[PDB]
């Protein structure tokens, strides 16, 4: 509109009204030119193509995208505490994304000294894919998202994708995409960009922990009318076989009939925190649970939602069972245990089997006079009629939504890293700098503001529980810093992952 | 005709495990290193960023469809075993004491990329013309392969980490699959059996499931 007229204001806050929460987040961004305005093929052959499991083929693009998939983008540590303590459920309703205050800086480097001046006639192309025609990279829990802390300025990640491959080669079915082939919106220093998105109806995330267990649903005061075989033999000796039945009752609760059974399981290897209790060998990949696709083994990470450990155990965790977050300052390769944050999914232990335990036992033969009864362990159990299970929990750090893949059929589309499965998720937002003059261009970058607004719908806590619930609290003791704040150097760190499950319900 | 879902007649230009952005790291870490090095008592826990370099350890939101393994048969006879295994080695399901061959069974990839000759024993329709479900490999496991691995024990100082193969795997939450491709010589519709319950009523020989067909 004008060179000296701002194209938008700063909106950050979280107003809570009724059963809905509106969160507004504004940041500052910088978008460099990627690949010198070139689309370039990429494959592991550039990196040497060491492994077959690591093989990939795809393309890098000059475009950049805006990502707000992680939960901490939209929630402060206070807003997240206000959410998880007071509610049994939540889910996104509406989305509003504004892009404004465009500034194009030209870098002038003359004889080793560099001066940065404005380019007022430059444009910045932006578009969204609302037909879901491009590959969707927002569901892989990638880096480059909006910062948790409102005063941080973030760099936009570079958009690239992958397609079919054999080794590092392509195949006749592989696809190539030119994002220039979409209609886009051009922005000079006074222009702005916005769009609104409507989430499709999803089930409320269950931010609660059961106060009962699946094997303890029965009234403990009354005997069942069902019967179970108690004794197969009268006494030790020859020809002592007999059939004797007993009432299923509170004295023996393991044999009582039940209408429902715990959810599916795919076992993980359990790693002990005390290093001397672990096996003295390298088993991170060898002893890992994995699945195969097109002749390539992929690790089962995180996989099906299962309890991390049995109650009363604090020193064991599944090898690939839970999401692991790095603390700030943590290095890219082989960092120590203190640097990382391994999440715990012990809340779901009541309805789900433990990740590191067998589902149960089955008979593998017919008992007879000649042969004794034999059972064997179920390492993995698929869906059975009568099963119930809890989805994996969502974290302040972790991802929000995923795109349900497009297939003939799926079961329980909820994503395995947590969050809301959607066949039409929030659309990708693609942005780039317009090349300004052919391989010779002008050194150029752009910057501005990004505001995002999501309306959340809440499910209130109706519980009749008499005693007080567990709540997420800030511990009170003296320390050199307060948690979830900046230190003396200006670095804002998040000390721990905050789960969503504190309040309880009946099973 | 009652309402049926549109039959998919397209092949994915991506694979389930490559959905990632190749240029960017994940914020998730994995356990890279359990031992500092060779020698006695060299035990440690070290974590690395999951990213473009190592793509098989990254976190994933979805996993491939179910599998019930078919025995593999090579079109070159000399590579096959010199024995009669058509029935003795068949994948089958038992009903009321009678063993029925699992023909065709769950939709899976007929063969891995680069192995045109091999095909599942009973896994394909045969009109002889043996059809192969090459397209479904992106979201489906291969017919002749194990679904994956699971741990069979608790590793400790005394015992090494032990795995075991998954030959059949039922539905899990988070799975996706492609049905069997319909053919010009193949069937159109089938009658869904009248039962208390069923899952994914689509018929296994291909085509549309209907409770009230023609």
């Amino acid at each position, epitope marked *: 509109d004008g060179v000296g007229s701002s194209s938008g204001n700063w909106h950050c806050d979280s107003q809570w009204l009724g059963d809905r929460v509106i969160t507004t987040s504004t940041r500052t961004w910088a978008l460099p030119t990627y690949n010198n305005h070139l689309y370039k093929q990429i494959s592991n052959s550039t990196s040497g193509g060491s492994s077959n499991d690591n093989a990939y083929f795809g393309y890098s693009t000059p475009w950049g995208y805006f990502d707000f998939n992680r939960f901490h983008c939209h929630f402060s540590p206070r807003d997240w505490q206000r959410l998880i303590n007071n509610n049994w459920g939540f889910r996104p309703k509406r989305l509003n994304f504004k892009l404004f205050n465009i500034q194009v800086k030209e870098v002038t480097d003359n004889n080793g000294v560099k001066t940065i001046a404005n380019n007022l006639t430059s444009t910045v192309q932006v578009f969204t894919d609302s037909d879901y025609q491009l590959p969707y990279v927002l569901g892989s829990a990638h880096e480059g998202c909006l910062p948790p802390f409102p005063a941080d300025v973030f760099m936009i990640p570079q958009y690239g994708y992958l397609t079919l491959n054999d080794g590092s080669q392509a195949v006749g079915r592989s696809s190539f995409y030119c994002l220039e082939y979409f209609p886009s919106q051009m922005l000079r220093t006074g222009n702005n960009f916005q769009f609104s998105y409507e989430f499709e109806n999803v089930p409320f995330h269950s931010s609660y922990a059961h106060s009962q267990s699946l094997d303890r649903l029965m009234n403990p005061l009354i005997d069942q009318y069902l019967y179970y075989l108690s004794k197969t033999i009268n006494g030790s000796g020859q020809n002592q076989q007999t059939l004797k039945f007993s009432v299923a009752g509170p004295s023996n609760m393991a044999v009582q009939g039940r209408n429902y059974i715990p959810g599916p399981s795919y076992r993980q290897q359990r790693v002990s925190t*005390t*290093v001397t209790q672990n096996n003295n060998s390298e088993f991170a990949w060898p002893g890992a649970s994995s699945w195969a696709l097109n002749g390539r083994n992929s690790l089962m990470n995180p996989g099906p939602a299962m309890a991390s450990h049995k109650e*009363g155990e604090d*020193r064991f965790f599944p090898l690939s069972g839970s999401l692991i977050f790095g603390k700030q300052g943590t290095g890219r390769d082989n960092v120590d*245990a203190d640097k990382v944050m391994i999440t715990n999914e012990e809340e779901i232990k009541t309805t789900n089997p433990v990740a590191t335990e067998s589902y149960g036992q089955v008979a593998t033969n017919h008992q007879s006079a000649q042969a004794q009864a034999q059972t064997g362990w179920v390492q993995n159990q698929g869906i059975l009629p009568g099963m119930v299970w809890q989805d994996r929990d969502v974290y302040l750090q972790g991802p929000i939504w995923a795109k349900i893949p497009h297939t003939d059929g799926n079961f329980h589309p909820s994503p395995l890293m947590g969050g809301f499965g959607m066949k039409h998720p929030p659309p990708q937002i693609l942005i780039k700098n317009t090349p300004v003059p052919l391989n010779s261009f002008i050194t150029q970058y752009s910057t501005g503001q990004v505001s995002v607004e999501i309306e959340w719908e809440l499910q209130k806590e109706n519980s009749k529980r008499w005693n007080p619930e567990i709540q997420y609290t800030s511990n009170y*003791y003296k320390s050199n810093n307060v948690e979830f704040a900046v230190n003396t150097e200006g670095v804002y760190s998040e000390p*721990r992952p905050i789960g969503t499950r504190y309040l309880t319900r009946n099973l | 005709f009652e309402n049926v879902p549109f039959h998919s007649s397209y092949a994915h230009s991506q694979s389930l495990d490559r959905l990632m952005n190749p240029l960017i790291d994940q914020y998730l870490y994995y356990l890279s290193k359990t031992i*500092n090095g060779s020698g006695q*008592n060299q035990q440690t826990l070290k974590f690395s960023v999951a990213g473009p370099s190592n793509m098989a350890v990254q976190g994933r939101n979805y996993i491939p469809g179910p599998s019930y393994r078919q025995q593999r048969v090579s079109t070159t006879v000399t590579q096959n075993n010199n024995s009669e295994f058509a029935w003795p080695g068949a994948s089958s399901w038992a009903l009321n004491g009678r063993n029925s061959l699992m023909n065709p069974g769950p939709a899976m990839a007929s063969h891995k990329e680069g192995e045109d000759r091999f095909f599942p024993l009973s896994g394909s329709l045969i009109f002889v013309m043996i059809t192969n479900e090459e397209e479904i490999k992106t979201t489906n496991p291969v017919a002749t392969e194990s679904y994956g691995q699971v741990a069979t024990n608790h590793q400790s100082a005394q015992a090494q980490a032990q795995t075991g193969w998954v030959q059949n795997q039922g539905i899990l939450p988070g799975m996706v699959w492609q049905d069997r491709d319909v053919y010009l010589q193949g069937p159109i519709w089938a009658k869904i059996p009248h039962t208390d319950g069923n899952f994914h009523p689509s018929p296994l020989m291909g085509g549309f499931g209907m409770k009230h067909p023609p």
Partner: antibody, heavy 131, light 110 residues
Framework: SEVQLLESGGGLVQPGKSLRLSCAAS????????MSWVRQAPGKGLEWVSG????????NYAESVRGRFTISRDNSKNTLYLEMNSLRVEDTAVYYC???????????????????????WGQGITVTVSS | VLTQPPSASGTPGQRVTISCSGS????????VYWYQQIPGTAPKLLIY???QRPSGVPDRFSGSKSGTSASLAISGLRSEDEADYYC????????????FGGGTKLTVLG
């Protein structure tokens, strides 16, 4: 000095006999730190005997005291308990109750490396094993 | 175990260094803690997490770790700084133990 640890149950015990030590903790959240017992023999350096996790699920012991001693804690009563069996003259020492400085919870896991560091100690109770 | 010199000596206002030698399992891969104890009293924490120090501890006490050895340096030594020093670190080997050094008795001469 907000944090306070007390020890009771110290005394003179003949060899072979077993006695129980208790520590009363106050001024901090007890179940969120892993406690430990450290013993100092007269005219000798400090020696760590055993430590327990905040939940109480995992416990560690020094080789010398292993199998004779057992460490337990009652989180409801904020008490660290050390039960010693088959005592011997070698056990005469001043036993201390040391609180684990690092704070952790159910969201994370117990890490013996990080959580055994002890910021505050206790006065200690002398224990004598003589005939 | 962690090895420490039995005694160390200093003059007031002069820097003194106390060091503990350790194996790969303890000093090499784990944080080292320093405890100051005066006889007839429960120990006090001086340095934790290699170079960090708790509040209420004077600036002069500095601790560092290189390789398998950790050194505690005292500057502006005082009469009240004379006590026994214990070096501690977690030991991965032999089932996991917290190990204290043998102790060092710092004497302020003069």
């Amino acid at each position: 000095s907000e944090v306070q640890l007390l020890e009771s149950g110290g005394g003179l015990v003949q060899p072979g006999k077993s006695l129980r030590l208790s520590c009363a903790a106050s001024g901090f959240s007890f179940s969120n730190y892993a406690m430990s017992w450290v013993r100092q023999a007269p005219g000798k350096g400090l020696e760590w005997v055993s430590g327990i996790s905040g939940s109480g699920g995992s416990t560690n012991y020094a080789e010398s005291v292993r199998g004779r001693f057992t460490i337990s804690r009652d989180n409801s009563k904020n008490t660290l308990y050390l039960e010693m069996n088959s005592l011997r003259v070698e056990d005469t020492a001043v036993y201390y109750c040391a609180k684990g400085m690092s704070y952790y919870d159910r969201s994370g896991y117990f890490w013996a490396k990080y959580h055994y560091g002890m910021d505050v100690w206790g006065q200690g109770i002398t224990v004598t094993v003589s005939s | 175990v962690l090895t420490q010199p039995p005694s160390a000596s200093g003059t007031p206002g002069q820097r003194v260094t106390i060091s503990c030698s350790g194996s790969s399992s303890n000093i090499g891969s784990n944080y080292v803690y320093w405890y100051q104890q005066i006889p007839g009293t429960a120990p006090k924490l001086l340095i934790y997490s290699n170079n960090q120090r708790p509040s209420g501890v004077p600036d002069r006490f500095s601790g560092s770790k290189s390789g398998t050895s950790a050194s505690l340096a005292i500057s502006g030594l005082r009469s009240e700084d004379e006590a026994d020093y214990y070096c501690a670190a977690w030991d991965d080997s032999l089932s996991g133990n917290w190990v204290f050094g043998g102790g060092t008795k710092l004497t302020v001469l003069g």
